[PDB]
Ligand binder design. Structure first.
Ligand SMILES: C[C@@H](c1cccc2c(-c3ccc(CS(C)(=O)=O)c(F)c3)c(C(=O)O)[nH]c12)N1CC(CCCN)OC1=O
Ligand SMILES: [Zn+2]
Ligand SMILES: [Zn+2]
Length: 232
């Protein structure tokens, strides 16, 4: 009923949308992994009379439910999707998207890692993002590669019309107590990558983490703080 949703409102298999700004929504779903349940976020950005999707809803059935929820709540077609790194919370559901008319994109690094992991593989490669600090335009967003953080391939997304910074899994929510799933992380480079984000997007008004509640720019410093303590 208006607050940002959590698992206690999200059974696995259901998707909720949350209006972030004009023409910007997050999507929230939940999934089981290794016997625990987690929420995860993605983004939807209005692109004229179409929609750009950032990240799947963490699995095939969640992603089908996402498309249904978008049709119910927004009613514009999703034409393109970008996955911001290679893990299942970002690409699991790409096959569903591809069979629903959506053109799927990721960096070549993400595509290679997804293929090696046995995860679903976006169709199209996003060039121009291979060096930290690189940025490219993609419809109504800017894609930015900050350097290695949660993963070596993680991308962040900026919506300039609304000053919305979608950090993906390189950014944690303010309540976080540790740096999340660090299996593929670079804890030593992560603060430097976060500093790059802070320097590039100083006018961000909303910051959305890969998992958990949006807030403001403090999410970036908080992330650096929890990661430094995790490394140590
Ligand atoms: C599918 C993904 C994965 C699965 C399960 C959980 C997460 C988490 C996670 C965990 C805890 C918290 C709360 S908190 C900040 O307070 O701790 C959280 F916010 C996020 C993250 C992430 O942090 O983004 N991602 C997860 N996977 C799979 C995987 C294995 C790759 C092996 N090569 O690696 C990975 O990330
Ligand atoms: Zn991940
Ligand atoms: Zn994640």
């Amino acid at each position: 009923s208006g607050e940002y949703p959590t698992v206690n409102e999200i059974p696995v298999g259901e998707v909720r949308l949350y209006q972030i700004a004009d023409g910007v929504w997050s999507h929230i779903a939940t999934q089981s992994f290794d016997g625990a349940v987690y929420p995860s976020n993605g983004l939807i950005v209005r692109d004229g009379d179409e929609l750009l999707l950032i990240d799947t809803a963490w699995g095939a059935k969640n992603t089908a439910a996402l498309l249904a929820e978008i049709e119910k709540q927004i009613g514009l077609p999703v034409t393109r999707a970008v996955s911001t790194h290679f893990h299942d919370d970002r690409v699991g559901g790409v096959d569903v998207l591809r069979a629903a008319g959506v053109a799927t994109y990721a960096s070549p690094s993400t595509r290679r890692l997804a293929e090696a992991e046995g995860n679903e593989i976006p169709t199209h490669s996003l060039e121009g993002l291979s060096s930290s600090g690189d940025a490219v335009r993609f419809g109504p967003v800017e894609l930015f590669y900050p350097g290695a953080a949660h993963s070596t391939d993680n991308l962040v997304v900026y919506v300039p019309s609304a000053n919305v910074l979608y950090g993906g899994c390189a950014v944690h929510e303010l309540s976080s107590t540790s740096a999340g799933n660090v299996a593929d992380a670079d804890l030593a480079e992560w603060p430097t990558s976060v500093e790059r984000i802070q320097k590039h997007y100083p006018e961000a008004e909303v910051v959305i983490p890969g998992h958990g509640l949006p807030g403001g720019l403090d999410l970036l410093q908080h992330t650096a703080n929890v990661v430094k303590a995790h490394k140590n």
